[PDB]
Structures are given as C-alpha cells and as structure tokens.
Design a protein around this ligand. Structure first.
Ligand SMILES: [Mg+2]
Ligand SMILES: [Mg+2]
Ligand SMILES: [Mg+2]
Ligand SMILES: [Mg+2]
Ligand SMILES: [Mg+2]
Ligand SMILES: [Mg+2]
Ligand code: NA
Ligand code: NA
Ligand code: NA
Ligand code: NA
Ligand code: NA
Ligand code: NA
Ligand code: NA
Ligand code: NA
Lengths: 1007, 1009
C-alpha cells in the first residue's frame, strides 16, 4: 500500500483526538492531578533496529525480536544514537521535491517492546496505546497483528489495542519511516531527525466513558462575574441513570458544582446530542488568569451513576480569562497586551528533539527571569507538558499547527491545492481538539511559511467557528491576508520599508496605517539573534510603547540548535549544519538563539531583559517617576534601590518601597545630594528588586534598572608638572624616547610604535597599528541559505587586504615632552581607502597621549571600526575598566549595559559564540586597566587571547587556540552589529561609520 | 483493506478534477464544439453479474468473463434491470446508522468490458478512463491489474490507464458497491439505486497538456466594457518554446486573441507558477448572458509551440455576466433577479437515474414554456450535459454538492465532525473544479439537509476564496447561518410563522427584517407540489413582487419520481415507495412534481406558469397597462391579443403589437365598447402571444394572460308564465311530482330525491344527498415519513365526518299556484353529536326546472369540513362535459388564478386528473352553468364529474387499480376547502380557505336539456 506516499492517507484506525486524559477512578486524585493507575508509561528500554528502506525489514521481526537489534532508550531520535545522521537544512527540502513521493532509500526504524498487561485491564473496558510523537509516519503491529498507521510527527496518535492484547506478555512492533508525504508539510528550519521521540503510554478507559470535554469561561463587563461552561461527550451505552458532575475548585475550596443526566439541547430538525451534556457554573469574583498572575482553578469532570458510583474522572486546570480583539487591539481580560515574546523550538544538545521536564522548567524560568511573558510554539504543537507549565507558571502561548512547506515553489503550491486540504486539515483540527482547554494558549496559528492558499482560508474559518475564544493568526502570503486576525510579519523593520514584490515587509509603524487597515500588529518573528546580534532591539521597544496597535512580538529565537559531538580525545564540542556529513546543509543558520544549547545566556539576553522591563522611569530634578506597565498586579514584591556614584566611586544609596498600581505611577524623592569630594560625572542607577522568592524567581532577583547622568564637575585643575623630561634618540631606523624606566620605540620605516619597555621587559608582541576591519559577525556575512552583504562589500573594496603606506614620520622636542607625528595611507589597487594622521606626545610624567584623525573615502563602504590594535606581551588575570558593562555591548546594543567600574577575569571578556567572530566589545569606556597598563579616553575595546585574524579564519569555537600574549583592540568608533535579519544588510544608518572624518584620543600610561 | 468503510479513503489513484476536456488536435473542431477523435465513449453493451457481497466475488473475474454474466446496457442502474430492488426511503437511512460501516450483505455489481485500444493512443500520450457516475463506490482493474478506487456517486472519477493498456483487445473490470461510507453523505429523498449510471469514456491527452483552465469575466460600471481573464495550467515538461493562445469568438467572428509563454507572476517569497499563465482579453460592448437572452461566446485555449505547431486545444462556451449581492439584493448584470425556479432531480420512470439528452431538452423546454428561469440541482452535481444545455437555452442554475446527511441525529452529527471534513471537502471542491466555467451556474450550494456544522463554515470560506464570482448558499441549520449568503429556507410560509425551536421557519416577510438581518431571501424549496397541490401559490408571487429582498424560490419539485411496473398482462403502471418490496419505505412521498414521470403536466403546472408571467397588467377604463418584468430584453416577440365575451359569447376582440422595454410600461386603449344585447356579465381576457418560434417555443406560444370582469347587466326580465302546472302525488312513503314526461320522487323516510325519470328512463343510480367530505388529498393526509394528529384527514376521521349518518328531521310537500315545494331538514351526527344540519327546499315549476336551495349549519367545534355540497350517481354516461365557469383545467379555491371564466367543453375523461395516488380531483370552481347529457345545472358552484365515487378514490392507493363505476358520479359543491401545499406534512390550508363560517347557503337549478 505505500501509505507513506499518499497524502489522502494520513492514518489508519486512529482514534479521535481529545484533551489530555488519565481515566482516574478516584475523584480526589483527579482534583490534585496525582498520577493515575490507569495511565501507564511505556517509556524506558526498547529494542531497535535500523534499515535503509522499509523493503529491507524482515517479516520475522513482526513476530519475533531480531537478535541484531540493540536495546535503546525511548523516547529518542535515532540520529542521536548514531544510527544515521541528522541533517540541517533551512529552506530546501532534504529530499527531492516530487510530491507526494519520497526517496526509495528511506531510513526505517524498527522499534519493539515486550511488556506485561494485567488481566484486570482486559476483563473490562478499553485499552489504548498513545504515541505522543513519532517522526515522520509509522505502522503499528501488536502480537504480530497489524493495528494501524499514523502521520503528523507532532501530535499524539492513539490506537485501540483491546482486541489485540492478552494477559501477561505482549509484543508491540512499530515501523517508523523517516520520510513520508507528511514530510512535505514538515519543512521547518531545524535539524531533520526521526524516531519515537515523545512519550508512549497505555491508557485504560471504561466502556462507558468521557470521550471529550470542552471548558469555556465567559464574563460580564467588568469581569466581576463569570460562567464556566463545560460540554461533555461520552461514548459507550446511554442509560438514564448516568450522570455527569462538573466541580470547580480553587485550591482546596470547592467553588461550584453541577450535575446532569446526558441529553443536550435541541440542535436542528433531528433533535440534539443525546450523548452530550453542558453543565454551567456561576462564579462570583473569579480570580483571573494572566501571565502576571497565573491564578488557576481545577475543573473535575465525573462520569457516574445516579446511585453515586464513580465510573471515571477526567479534569483540567482552568484559567478564567477572555481574549478578544476590539477596536484594533488584542485584549486580555479587557486590557491591551504588550507581548514580550520569544519563538522556541524543542531542542536539546544531547537528546535532539526529545523534551524533558527539567529542560522545559529551566527554559520557562529563564524566560520569566528575563522579562518574557509569551512564547510561540515555532512551528508545531509541543509536548503536552509544555502547556501545563505555561498555564501554571504564567506565559501567553501561540499554539501552531505542524504545517510548513517553505521549500515549495511558489510557497503556496500545496496549501492552495485542494488535494492537500485533508492532510492540512488534520494538522489544524487535531491540535485544536487536544489543546483548547489550556488557558495559556491565547492564539492559534495555522502554521508557518507555507505561502497563502485557499486551504488556509478554509482552516482559519474552521477554527473561528469551533473556538471563538481565541484569535487566529498566520503570516504566510504577506502577513496581512484574509487568514489572519493579527498583522504578524516576520522581520519587518521599525522605520524602514522592504518593498518586496507581492509580499512586501512594510515598516511596522507604516503598516498599521495603510489604507483600510485596522488590525493589531505583533511580529511573529523579529530581532534575529544569530550570533553577535540584537543590534537595534531598543528601537522596536520604543515603537511598541509609543504605538497602541504595535503590541509587541516574538524574538527569533530562544535557543541555539547546536548539537554535541566528541573529538578524537572524547571531548565535547558544539556542532552545526554539515558537521554530521549532512549535505546539502545550511551551516550555522541553525543557531539563532538568545541562549546557547546548554542554556547559558548569550550577551543579547540582557538587552532583551532590559528592554522588556515592566517599570518605566523618568527623572526630574531629584524626583524619579516610576510607571508600572503591569495590567493586573500591583508592585507587591518590589522595592526600589538607588545608587549615586562619581566616576564609579560610590557616594550614596537608598531604598524605597514601590507601591504602584497597574498602569499607575509613583513619585520618589531622592535625598539631598551634598557635594562630591572631587571632579567628574555623577551617575544615578536604580534597580527594581524583588525581596521575596516566587515560583519563578529567587529572593533578591533584579527585574528592572535604569541610569542617568547627574551633575558633572569638569576638571579644571592642572597637572603638577613633571619632575623630569623625556629624551629622544634619533637614528635612521628609529625614534627612541626614554623616561626613567620606560622606553618607547617608533620604527621609522613603518611609522608605528614597535616596542615599549618597562624596566627590562618588552611590552609588545606586535606593533600598535590602525585597524579598520573586524572578524565578520553572522549579520556581516548575511547568509540564511548577497553582494550587498557588509562582508562582501568590505572584501570587494580591499579593506581586509589593505597595506599601510608611510607618508610621514617625524620627531620634535617640546619643553616638556617628545612629540612623534605620523601619517599613513591605506590603499588598495591604487585606491586610497583611509588616511590616518597621528601625534604621540610623551611627557615628563611618563604618559603617552595619542591623537588620531582618520579620513575615510566617501566612496568606500563605511568601515567596521576605526581604532588601533596590538598584541601585548603580557597575560594578566583581570580586566578592570570604567565604562559600560559588565557584559559585551555594542553601539546598537548597549542599553542594558551600565556605566560603572567593572572588574572581570580575562576570560569573561571573550564571548564564545559557536561560530567565532568579533566579540566581547565594551563601549563608552573612559578607563581600562590590564596588567601594568592603563588607557584613558572615550573608546570601545575588546581584549582577549584571540586575534581578529584568527577569529575570522576559524569556523568553530572549539578550534580556537590562545595566542601568545593578549590582543587588545581599542576603538575610537565601531559600527553597530545589526540583526533586524541575518540575511541582508541590517545595520541602521545611524550606526554606520559614514562621517568621512573621525577623531579620537587615547592616553596610555603605566599603573 | 475495506476502503468502502473508511471515510478517510475516498479514492485511490484518482486523477485531479477539471472542467470538461476533449483534447481536440484541430482548433476549428474545438471552436465549433464538434466530436473529438480523442474522446471516446465506452457506453453500450457490457458484461454484468450481481453478487450479494464483495466477498462473494470470484477472483477469476479479474482475469476473465464469468460465464454466468449477462450482457446489459451501460449506463444503467442495476435495479432497473431487475437484479435487486430500488428502495424509496425519505429521511431514514436505508442501512443501519453505524458510521462508517455498512451492511455485510452489500449488493455488488461486477461490470466488465472487452474493448479495443489503438496503438496510436499508446505510442505517445496519456490514455485515461472517465466514469461520470458510479453509485456508490467502486474498485477498477484493467487487464487483471488493480488501478484504483473512487467515491462520490455524482462526480466523474478518472484514472490513468496508460501503463495498463496494450494495443488491441483489453478488458476492464469494475466492482461497484451499493453501499459505502459515501452513502452516509448521500441520504437524499429519492430512490436508492446503484451502478454505472452515467457515461464511461476514454480520453487521450498529450504528455504536455492543458491540465486545467479557468475563465473569468469582470466588467466596468455600466457593462459596456469587459476583461476576459483565462488562467491556464499545464502538465508535462516545461520548455521555453511552449505557448498558450486564448481566442474569443462570437460565432464566426474572432473578437480577441492573445498569446504568451508559461510563467505566472510572483506570488510569494518563493516566486510564482512556472507551469501557469494568465491571458487577459479586452472586450468592448460584450453581448451579455442572461436567462432572457443567453448570448454566448466561444473561448478556445490552444497549447502550442512557438513555431506554430498545435499540441492540443480545449474550449468552452463563455457567457459574459456578473453575479453579485449588493445592498441585500442578488443582482445579475446589475439588475435584481426574480427567480422563477424549480428543483429538479435526475429521474426517468424507465431508466431510473440515467439521463439522456432528449429527456433533458424535454425538461428545459417545458420549464421555459412554463415561465421558469432557474433550476436547482437538488441535491448533487448533474450529468455534465445539463450545464451545457442551461448555458445555451438560458436557465439560472444553483450547482449543489452531493452532501446530504438528513438521517443522522442530530442532523449535523457528521458535518460538525472534523473527521468528516475531508470527505465532505472533496464533494464541494471537485464540483467547483468541474463546473466553474459554466455561465448558467450562478450560485453554489454546500449540499442539503445536513444540519449546520463547522465543516460547512470551512467549505463556505474555501469557495468564497477560490471563486468570488458566485454567492454561496446553504439551508441547513436554520437557513440563515454563517455558511450562507442568501436566506434560503425550505417551506417557510408567506405570512405565517412556524416557530420551531432552534430552526424556526419565520414568515418570509418577517424573516427579512429580523434585527440585524440584511440578506436577500430566495426559498431553496417551496410550494410542495405533491398530488393535488400548489394551493396558495399566488400568495408567494404577490409577496415576491411586493418585497424587493424577496427574490423568488425553487418549487419542490419538477417531476414525480414514480417508476414503471408491469402487471399480469404486461401493462405498465406507475409505482411508488414499497412497490418493489422495499421496506421500510416512504410510499407516495417520492411523487411531488409539477409533472408526471412521463412529462405530462399536472394541473398545477399551469398555475405556476401564470403566476410566473413576465408581464403584469392593470386595467383602467378602456385602458390596459402592460408592465414588463424582463430585466434585459425588449418585448420583441410579443403581441397582445384581447377579447371581450358576454357569458362565454364573444362580442369583440383585437390585437396590438407589444413594445415595452425591460421594466417599461405600455398603454393600450381598447376601442369603443359597443353595448350588449343580453343580461349577463362581460368579461375581458388578454393574452400575450409570441408570433415567432424560438429555440424553446413554437410560433404562437402563449406566455401570459389575465382576465377582468367589465360591465354586468343583471337579468330583470321575469320568468315567462309556465304552460302547465306540476302535479304532486302523495303516498305513505313518497312525494312524487309529475310534469309532462318527467317525474321526481322524494322518499319520505330518507328525505332525499331518490329518483327522477325522463319518460320511462331512470336518471339516478344513487339518491341526491348532502356531502361534507372528500377523498383525502396527499396534503390532507400530511405524511412525509409518522402521523400528525393535527392533519386534516386525522381531524375529520376523529370527528366522525366520514362516518356521520343523515337523520331526517323534516320532510314536507306543499302545492303552490304554479309549483310544488318539498321542504326537508336533516342532521348529521356522530357519537350523539350533531355535526351538520342541512335545510333545503326543492321547488318544481311548470317549466320543469327544479330550484334547490340549501342552508347548512356546521357546529363550531367540529373541524371545518372539506366541502359543503351535494352528490349523486347519475345513471347515464355522456361523452362531453360543457360548462360556463373557470377552466379548462382542474382548479381549486386556493389554486384557481390561472383558470379563466369562459365556456368550456371537454371529453369526460379530461374531467378526471390521474394523480398516481388517487384522491379528490378534477374540480372546477366559479361555475354558473354545467351541462351533461340532457341535464343542466345552474347557480354559482364548484363541481367535479367522473366515473369514480369519492369512496372508491379514498379506498384506492394506485390509479391503475381504479375501475369506472356504472354511470357518472357528480359532486356539486356550494363550497369547497382549499387544497393547501405550503408543505405536505402538516396542516397547510390558509385560514381564508377553511369552511369556518358556521352557516352556508347555496342554490342550484336542475333542469332538462
Ligand atoms: Mg500518507
Ligand atoms: Mg492506587
Ligand atoms: Mg503469554
Ligand atoms: Mg522556514
Ligand atoms: Mg471510503
Ligand atoms: Mg432530505
Ligand atoms: Na503598543
Ligand atoms: Na535558523
Ligand atoms: Na512593593
Ligand atoms: Na569566523
Ligand atoms: Na421581490
Ligand atoms: Na419527496
Ligand atoms: Na412585439
Ligand atoms: Na386514495
């Protein structure tokens, strides 16, 4: 039958989809969500054998264990066990495009398990098997008899095994196909793996049973009263003595309860549903659910007889909340949301696509701790537990159908094709039937990157019809089609339009007001966090806050999809596309997250946390104005800490309790700030601290911060002039300067300071020279699978090959110092790119002041940076500076950083991006200390054991090796990093170094 | 595998749906729509064997002919060949409701065909087989190898046979299942049959071929300009040298033509369709298509190479027309339609569900001749030819998906179930892919009586998104759901609400104005024409004309679904439910048409033609004002004929040409109306006659008529003083009156006129007695499946109306100067209750006329009687019946608008209407004079006259079992109840036609001729 090559066959003998069941036979257990003896897990050790095609599978396997098989854990992705390679492809399908056919060589995973079933389960009732996730299609046999077939790798497939089992031992055999026609709908940008990768379980239900239940909550105008409506359906024999009781609890208190016999209201000329009933419960002053306060009730659904015998119980967590779009705004409990979201794929560096509770909880806590309030299930229904954690911890969720046909040409080839309507329809309907009772799901999504086809319109209407409680969104076909209630573009810019034909990406501000447009706009993906990125994040936040209808978005994306591999010596390392022999592949494009695969944060995570803060602040005089962005809670676990410092020197500080109602304001008046002991800039830093632990944070957590400059007292006092004067020695080869124990040597042919000595010690490994390039970032490279790419432009202009030419090198003696003047030109193929003019003035105090004036040809691409570099001979333990920090920060990604005195071990000054590049910069620095050296001015810098050259020649962080010494890059100016997208120029004009002429000054001295 | 018990499998290996193709290899043949050598029919004689279940089918059959097989004609329904019984069930499914399973005993038809294939069809290109209609599911093998499977009995299923055929002789084998999961969606109220009932053909296409084409026509604001857009898709290897030319013709004239290579515009981030192309043609002053003037153009789509070599051509007829709903009105070419529609099932009394062109033409002509302009495909896509005929003759069509799950409980159990979404979507999507280029289709329908489920909502939106050119309608779930653009109820009444819970049927006038309602309302079914019905039809038309948003409706329905059966002697008779041993069954409920199964009209048809007239008239003084309800054509084939008569006698008449623009008016003054010499009422009759024949009518066709009373001159001239005086003879048991050679006898114990003689010849077989009942009509019976105790027949029976016996109260005789007067009084009672009291006088004068005066009392608490009249069985039989009253056809109080007051003369048999299920029939109302044999009755009455007593009619279930009684039964009524018909399963006679006055008077004069 080749069911795996026919989109008209998506399953055989599969049971209806429905919300999570456990068939409790004790109501109390159901109330508290205790494990159910009737829901058994079949997870653990299974037998597995790999074959190259289904035709290669021996018939014997059906009845008996293959002695060649291995014992492996389930759930798992077979790739993770080494059976075949995982493939990383972004857009292009991993198999030839020839729907609905798949390759003849099709990796087949043959799983089996010998397990016990007690007579008790078979004497009465129904025993079904549930496979929560099988990638991509499979056939199932039990005790050698075929049972059924299934597709859609991201929803549960259930089969009735009642007629196939026997008491005692039984054997299941599952043949899993890697590719199937379902793969045409699973083209998400992620590793392509396969196997039985979600839980497998057995569930016993009685013959007369609860087969479905839907829960709804409706409110009066001010949410002071609600009606919970529970529709219950049964299967099995209708009898008048049957009853359904629905009880609602808030903690240990029962709020309401109602009971009724089956038999629904009249529906049409033929009557009503005699196998259903709707119970309605009034609830006064319900505690409402939100991501701010995830108040939950428990609904327990009992199927029982009138005499009072329980047949079975089902249940769920209920969050009383209304989601509606009104007047152009998305409202939650009548208030307009501000989505601080992130896209999150199911990825584990060791386990592949298998999810576990610990990782899920770790992700949600880091999300919450970083001011995220929402998550998009990019791009398929998640493991069931995700929803329960979101309901209980409090996150808004976008639940998305497992439909992505990005590699088709044009993109909607399948989605506009009625023959694909059935297959797509099951992806949407079964998701809704499974997840509709979760309060955390606030919006349904039709899938991702599958163009816009009629199938979409049909399905959009189906959902609107069956579940009016949530908006439906879909971005394909231009982000604003008839299949979406929300304008939900991906990578639309704040101010700049990207007018692509047919599917333009307008500036978000402009998009809201195009003629006739009235919907809210929430980006389904924005701020592509690949590598050293998130430049311009603040620009989005400023617009979201200014424009009512700009309600936020979902950053792309949470975690890097890197996988662990082992080197020849068994050490682990982070791998990406192509590292498994996979080809074609999309290399590093699989790593776009705010956190590394092990959950360590990248530096961008702090920028996101700060911009996503829930408290806004303004300063006037001595008055700090705090405004709350919360919609529902008061600041009942928050205090404000304030600190004032003079050039990093702590002056004073205080604490004030915060008592701000949602959307309210609080005025706090700072105490008299009595004169600073010396000159400099006073800085005010405020931090919102949570004194009490919560379910998602520890006592002391800081949730928000802000700084301002206060009074500045410029230094007008002079320097107690030199006890001495430096001496200059001139030679054809060099200009040497000596002062006490110091010596500086300027090479006359090169025109650079080539060596420095303190005592007998040489301070330099490589001379101090101008630098106008950087080890390109992922965004500079711009590839997702462009000669407009910054890297391309730079290379083409000769920026990385340019050679300095000496125009002038002279020495002069002043009354108290020695002054060296140089001028160099950087040229390429006759073209003068840059001209650097400098003066170095060494004085009686031993300080070397360097003044640099650079000219940039207006017609060369603006340079990545304008500074100097050198390789210091020494390797020191700490890096101390007065500037922004403590983490890495760049011009267009420095808002989260704070101006203060920071001191870190050298290593923290390096950000180990998997794909190495320029990294570790710190901006707005006025003082930098390392070893015996001190540099002063107003610059940006990075310091590490890796040169820019090495970083640009290395593909993987594990292959980096520390060089002799310490490479110092000190810049007067540095270009922003961009990141609106990672596959086109994305650095805003204001962060490009296009001024033509640049000036900067550094003071280098000892410590 | 049992694919016939799994709605997730509706086919295997079936090819995509598309509009009609013929793969012409010459463009001129495509232009002219001539036969294509690449399209072959496989209709004719095939081999067939019947089995009780698929399990009983021998494997040998795959390879070779079963000896046991018969040779039968295909297309056919196997029940019509006698292999098994057709079943007539209305709502209840014919199989136990246990979706998706079917009975294990599942009648299987094994059809096979040995035929030739030329090598030329195999050496290159693709050879596919096309089954236009297979009921209900089937597996296909070719030369013993399995090909595929298909469901949906009402759309074509195609398979590629290229790899299965060899030059020369080949054999196909088709195993057809009577029942399948598809049956759950085929519960329409009609005969349940099976087999290969529509055409089977072989189509040869080139490997590089036109695989689909869509034609759209958009207009400027005043339709003076249009753009023809043709989207073309191909299959095969793409090559830069390939081209598509689309040409538009108006007869022989090439109006426009454009050519382009393949490659559509960018659609999204991944590009456009390299395998498609859109050609855009400008058309100035296009001739527009309408049912009024079905102007058509021909679009020719050529797939060719740059050098000019034709690969193949496909084509269609194009009608430039726009359909839109605006401001609550359904507009065609910017004008609001008035739908004079009818529902039409595909039914033939000998061939079952098999359709032929002749029958189709016959239907269309009769439709057009009877002023219908639209048809609803109740309830599934029709044979493909139907659409071509409607495009060319001009009829508006509602194309309806084959989805009906009426028997479920509740009705939407499957349509609200996502698991049934796929099977349902195929029924909708494949219909649209097939029929979207036909101009006659103006509205799509999602099916019928399937409640309202989310699947509908989904499918409604799919259509709206793929084809914005036609509104979508669906009646299930209450007629005004979110899945319909049009309020389209079934059997909603004009003024009376039927407030059923959840799915009330409001009065149509009220429905339009419910809070927030704005859509147009067109009944998808109304005026149930079952038996003697269509009472109250004029009330619908008056409302449609008065309310802009009431845009008409589709009568239920065109033709009776009766089947032919043959008696002992081999004589044919019309059979209905149960007549084939089918059980359970819904008896006569399958006969609801305006015509008999053989196309002979029922009397109701004329009432429909008259109320559906396109010209309205008003009379003022000598002025006739004629208004045109046409929207597009001028009255260029019409003349007004007028005639004035005094009680049947023609005084004058004349003719005037009609020249009215659409929606215009014309005034015609009659010439000086020269007085009349005679008492009596002058009557004016006007008729609209089409002098020239047309594609759908013959010269002289009458399309409209109207009548008015003009002056009346009451007779004031006295009698004429009789020659002789009648003599009364009194005896213990009788009053006898003698005058000349005539005698009348009144029985003193009964109180009735028992005998009358002319000379020595007795004129009566049964005495003349009051009658208060009628042989119940189908509407009186009120059954659609279940008994309605509110049914009129039920009420009358319970009240004792058919059992009441006359009790004499008084019987006296008096002699007057010139006459004898008999006075009588009788009571009708039941269970000691007096139902009616009849008081009469009989006055017999010297002229021999007997004046009958009747005064009846009807108790207020008894149900209103069917009639208040007299009856008798005349001893003689006469050849003709002549009357001065309404006619010529049968007419009833609530269905007499089309009848005209005049002097009519017909053979007796025409005075009887042969309704398959017998009942009261053949009445004529408003009669002032009736002549039969030597008898003449005068007054103001309604009458019926025939060889069948009411008793017989009410005791016989089939017209073929009636026998002429001795003599002639005459029923003459002072009053007769309306017939009703708004529906036929509940009381449907409007108040105003009920005999509820309590006291009634009528008088008649019986005399000799
Ligand atoms: Mg399949
Ligand atoms: Mg226990
Ligand atoms: Mg055993
Ligand atoms: Mg993608
Ligand atoms: Mg099936
Ligand atoms: Mg029906
Ligand atoms: Na906003
Ligand atoms: Na990616
Ligand atoms: Na507080
Ligand atoms: Na690199
Ligand atoms: Na109207
Ligand atoms: Na019927
Ligand atoms: Na005329
Ligand atoms: Na009868």
């Amino acid at each position: 039958r080749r069911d795996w090559e026919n989109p008209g066959v998506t399953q055989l003998n599969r049971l209806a989809a429905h919300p999570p069941f456990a068939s409790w036979r004790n109501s109390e257990e159901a109330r508290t969500d205790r494990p159910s003896q009737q829901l058994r897990s079949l997870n653990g050790e299974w037998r597995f054998a790999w074959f190259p095609a289904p035709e290669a599978v021996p018939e014997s396997w059906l009845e008996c264990d293959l002695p060649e098989a291995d014992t492996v854990v389930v759930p798992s992705n077979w790739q993770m066990h080494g059976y075949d390679a995982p493939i990383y492809t972004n857009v292009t399908y991993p198999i030839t495009v020839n729907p609905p056919f798949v390759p003849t060589e099709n990796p087949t995973g043959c799983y089996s398990l010998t397990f016990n079933v007690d007579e008790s389960w078979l004497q009465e009732g129904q025993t079904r098997i549930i496979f929560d996730g099988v990638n991509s299609a499979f056939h199932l046999w039990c005790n050698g008899r075929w049972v059924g077939y299934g597709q859609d790798s991201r929803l549960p497939s259930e089969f009735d095994l009642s007629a196939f089992l026997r008491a005692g031992e039984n054997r299941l055999a599952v043949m899993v196909l890697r590719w199937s026609d379902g793969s045409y709908l699973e083209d998400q940008d992620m590793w392509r793996m396969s196997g039985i990768f979600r839980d497998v379980s057995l569930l016993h239900k009685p013959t007369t049973q609860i087969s479905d239940f839907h829960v709804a909550t409706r409110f009066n105008d001010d949410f002071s009263r609600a009606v919970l409506e529970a529709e219950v359906q049964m299967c099995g024999e209708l009898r008048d003595y049957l009853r359904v009781t629905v009880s609602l609890w808030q903690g240990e208190t029962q709020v309401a309860s109602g009971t009724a016999p089956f038999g629904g209201e009249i529906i049409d000329e033929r009557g009503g549903y005699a196998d259903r009933v709707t119970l309605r419960l009034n609830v006064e002053n319900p505690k409402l659910w939100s991501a701010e306060i995830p108040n939950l009730y428990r609904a327990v659904v009992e199927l029982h007889t009138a005499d009072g015998t329980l047949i079975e119980a089902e249940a769920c967590d209920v969050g009383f909340r209304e989601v509606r779009i009104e007047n152009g705004l998305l409202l939650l409990n009548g208030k307009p949301l501000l989505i601080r979201g992130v896209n999150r794929h199911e990825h584990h560096p060791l386990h592949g696509q298998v999810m576990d509770e610990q990782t899920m909880v770790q992700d949600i806590l880091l999300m919450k701790q970083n001011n995220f309030n929402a998550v998009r299930c990019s791009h398929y229904p998640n493991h069931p537990l995700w929803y329960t954690l979101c309901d209980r911890y409090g996150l808004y969720v976008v639940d998305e159908a497992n439909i992505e046909t990005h590699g088709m040409v044009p993109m909607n080839r399948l989605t506009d094709d009625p023959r694909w309507l059935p297959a797509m329809s099951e992806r949407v309907t079964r998701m809704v039937q499974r997840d509709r009772n979760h309060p955390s799901v606030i919006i349904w999504s039709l899938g991702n990157e599958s163009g816009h086809g009629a199938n979409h319109d049909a399905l959009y209407r189906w959902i609107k019809s069956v579940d009016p409680s949530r908006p439906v969104q879909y971005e394909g076909g231009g982000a604003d089609t008839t299949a979406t209630d929300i304008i939900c573009p991906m990578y639309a810019r704040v101010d700049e339009d990207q007018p692509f034909p047919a599917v333009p990406k307008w500036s978000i501000k402009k998009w809201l007001s195009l003629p006739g447009e009235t919907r809210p706009l929430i980006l389904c993906e924005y701020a592509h966090a690949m590598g050293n990125s998130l430049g311009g994040f603040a620009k989005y936040w400023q617009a979201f806050r200014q424009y009512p209808r700009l309600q936020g978005g979902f950053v792309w994306d949470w975690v890097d999809q890197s996988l662990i591999k082992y080197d020849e010596n068994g050490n682990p390392w982070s791998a990406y596309g192509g590292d498994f022999g996979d080809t074609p592949n999309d290399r590093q494009f699989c790593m776009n997250g705010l956190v590394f695969a092990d959950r360590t944060p990248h530096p961008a995570l702090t920028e996101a946390k700060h911009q996503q803060q829930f408290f806004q602040f303004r300063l006037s005089g001595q008055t700090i104005e705090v405004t709350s962005e919360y919609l529902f809670r008061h600041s009942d676990n928050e205090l404000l800490h304030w600190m004032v410092a003079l050039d990093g020197k702590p002056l004073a500080s205080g604490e004030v309790p915060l008592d701000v109602a949602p959307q309210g304001k609080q005025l706090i008046e700072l105490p008299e700030l009595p004169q600073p002991e010396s000159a400099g800039q006073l800085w005010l830093t405020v931090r919102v601290v949570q004194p009490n632990a919560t379910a998602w944070s520890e006592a002391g957590h800081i949730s928000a911060w802000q700084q301002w400059r206060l009074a500045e007292n410029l230094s007008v006092t002079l320097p107690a002039a030199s006890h001495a004067i430096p001496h200059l020695t001139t030679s054809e080869m060099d200009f040497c300067i000596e002062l006490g124990n110091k010596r500086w040597q300027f090479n006359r042919q090169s025109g650079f300071l080539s060596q420095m000595w303190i005592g007998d010690k040489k301070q330099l490994l490589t001379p101090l020279r101008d630098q106008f390039t950087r080890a390109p970032l992922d965004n500079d490279i711009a590839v997702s699978e462009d000669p407009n790419a910054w890297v391309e432009r730079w290379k083409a202009a000769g920026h990385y090959q340019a050679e300095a030419a000496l125009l002038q090198c002279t020495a002069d003696t002043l009354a108290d110092a020695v002054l060296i003047t140089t001028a160099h030109a950087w040229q390429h193929q006759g073209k003068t790119l840059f001209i650097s003019r400098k003066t170095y003035r060494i004085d009686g105090s031993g300080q070397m002041a360097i003044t640099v004036d650079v000219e940039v040809a207006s017609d060369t691409p603006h340079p990545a940076r304008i500074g100097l570099n050198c390789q210091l001979a020494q390797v020191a333990e700490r890096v101390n500076w007065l500037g922004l920090g403590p983490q890495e920060n760049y011009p267009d990604r420095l808002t989260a950083a704070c101006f203060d005195r920071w001191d870190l071990p050298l290593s923290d000054m390096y950000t180990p991006y998997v794909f190495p590049s320029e990294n570790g910069l710190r901006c707005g620095t006025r003082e930098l200390n390392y070893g015996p050296h001190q540099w002063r001015g107003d610059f940006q810098f990075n310091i590490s054991r890796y040169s820019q050259q090495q970083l640009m020649e290395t593909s993987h962080r594990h292959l980096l090796h520390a060089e002799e010494g310490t490479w110092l890059n000190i810049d007067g100016f540095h270009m922003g990093i961009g990141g609106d997208d990672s596959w086109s120029p994305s650095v805003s004009a204001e962060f490009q170094l296009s001024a033509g002429r640049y000036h900067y000054q550094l003071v280098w001295c000892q410590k």
